[PDB]
Amino acid sequence: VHWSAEEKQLITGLWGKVNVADCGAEALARLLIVYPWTQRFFASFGNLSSPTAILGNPMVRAHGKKVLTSFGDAVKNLDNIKNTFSQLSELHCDKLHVDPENFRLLGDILIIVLAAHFSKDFTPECQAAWQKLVRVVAHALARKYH
Amino acid sequence: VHWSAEEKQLITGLWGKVNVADCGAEALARLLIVYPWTQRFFASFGNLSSPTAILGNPMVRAHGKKVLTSFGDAVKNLDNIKNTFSQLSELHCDKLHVDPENFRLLGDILIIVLAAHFSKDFTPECQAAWQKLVRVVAHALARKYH
Amino acid sequence: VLSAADKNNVKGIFTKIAGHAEEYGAETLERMFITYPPTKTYFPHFDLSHGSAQIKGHGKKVVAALIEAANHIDDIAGTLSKLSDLHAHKLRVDPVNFKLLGQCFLVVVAIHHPAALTPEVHASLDKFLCAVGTVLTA
Amino acid sequence: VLSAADKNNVKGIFTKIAGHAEEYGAETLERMFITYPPTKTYFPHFDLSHGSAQIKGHGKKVVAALIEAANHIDDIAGTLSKLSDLHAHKLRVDPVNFKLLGQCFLVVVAIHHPAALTPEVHASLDKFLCAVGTVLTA
């Protein structure tokens, strides 16, 4: 895909203000609460028995930070997202067998988390650029299926 | 994707027995009848107002033959599908803006049409290979979205 | 279906959405048209520039319909049955678009009421928006 | 929802299915495991080789549950709500998998009863299978 100058600015500008630990923990916890079948992939994390348990779980929070940090690797090289995610694609597709529709759901949750953290600074044009970014990342993650 | 010798044999073997005109017309008519929102893309074809009208519409029948003929272009070069479908991807993505979930629905309908035509000759292994083929084609058709 | 907790979660956050129907509906539509430009195909008759009168009037109707479904949350299908013929038969809206509009609505709610949109409320509102989309595509 | 025509179409095709529950259920599962190998993850306790006793017994139960829902098609949620906790809470079956099993069931019906699976019956059965999937993921 092609990135315009305005899209790159909207992405890199917002990224510098993202609280990676907090937004990452919130996005993963929301994935597990809003779409509870995703809990099947995270039994190694222990207590996922309630929204409170999920939001307070050390392993959910630590993993969510790692996930959002990976999104940052996309932000830092927007024309090479495909190579950046090749190994992660092998993990999720060949080893974990995560259905790619779930990558879409996580990206949509991340958009809502960013909207909550940035309020009206998350303009419609900013949402458009970030929705494009999470779509491009989801596509890169799903590559090892095709 | 990679193709085994058995997969290639199942695909090319079944393809030689496919009634392209009848299976293509049937698959397209089933798409419009089973998923009626798809009719929005085919208003130029005239009367789609009932299952009888759809099944008797000569433009539906003619278009369905062209669609299945293109699947045949995939059969005839299984390792080059992405390039084969590049122009068609621009049409469907850039010009028509067909959501890619609809490509998945047409592929699934084609599998059911093949099952009806071939009965028990459409073995589980044959279904597996053909489902892979329609998935690979749908992915190639969606390329110009990414 | 919507559990008793889901219904309580949906009503609570909608007490803050009511009274902002035009503002939040207009923003939801503007977000959908900008984030997902193909959705503009369904509105060829509209002026789609920012803050146009047609977007404001239509956004108010969309959110007013949601508020109506919330008020009768026990039978959403009866409340929205007339809209189902319009969307599924007349307009032929592809079902994917209901998820896009729902995503934009959740973004608007998060922007204006982030503390109200807790994970549990987000989960209930997602189920409600999915139930509405199912009715409108029947 | 399911129309009166949908219900008669579904009941009609099931007069051909009802006597073959084990055979068609086993074939549906075998097709799902071969066509969509990730679905095997939910059955680690099974022998998944062709015609295994566990596949035959389980396939009979799946189709028997569908027949129950056909016999009580006016309230599918009431007949099958007992399976919702199993699939959504205990097993955490990803919702994508219900479409995969439904596709395999339609292939089995097409193989054995092609003339009965007209476009209109296909449309009704797709709505029926989608309604079952919503009950089991609730």
Ligand code: HEM
């Ligand atoms: C765009 C979406 C996603 C991105 C960028 C992403 C990223 C990552 C990354 C960077 C890791 C490495 C963790 C580490 O190094 O310790 C990981 C692991 C993992 N991911 Fe994802 N992921 C995504 C979506 C998902 C989804 C949707 C699921 C499940 C529904 C999932 C399930 C897992 C699991 C189970 C692990 C292994 C966790 C562990 O064993 O510690 N991922 N993911």
Ligand code: HEM
């Ligand atoms: C997924 C596999 C599909 C294949 C292989 C395929 C193939 C084709 C082909 C070969 C054409 C002919 C272009 C030409 O004659 O110049 C075409 C046109 C077209 N396709 Fe598809 N198609 C697929 C799916 C779909 C779907 C799912 C839709 C809509 C829901 C769709 C809508 C259209 C339309 C509207 C046209 C233009 C028809 C006209 O103006 O005559 N296609 N497609």
Ligand code: HEM
């Ligand atoms: C939560 C989901 C939705 C709700 C509650 C909703 C509600 C409504 C309402 C109340 C109307 C006016 C009905 C009337 O005036 O008789 C309407 C019309 C319309 N809707 Fe929706 N809608 C939804 C989703 C969608 C989506 C996803 C699309 C397309 C992307 C769409 C496209 C339209 C169009 C084109 C009209 C006609 C507008 C006009 O001519 O003024 N709607 N909808």
Ligand code: HEM
């Ligand atoms: C039409 C959709 C489905 C129906 C009607 C259905 C029906 C059933 C029934 C009747 C049982 C046995 C309940 C009992 O013995 O108490 C069962 C169990 C089970 N189902 Fe489903 N099912 C469906 C879809 C699925 C799907 C899509 C999956 C996963 C891909 C799945 C995985 C399982 C598993 C793992 C069990 C436990 C089996 C055992 O331990 O013997 N089911 N289902």
Ligand code: NA
């Ligand atoms: Na291509």
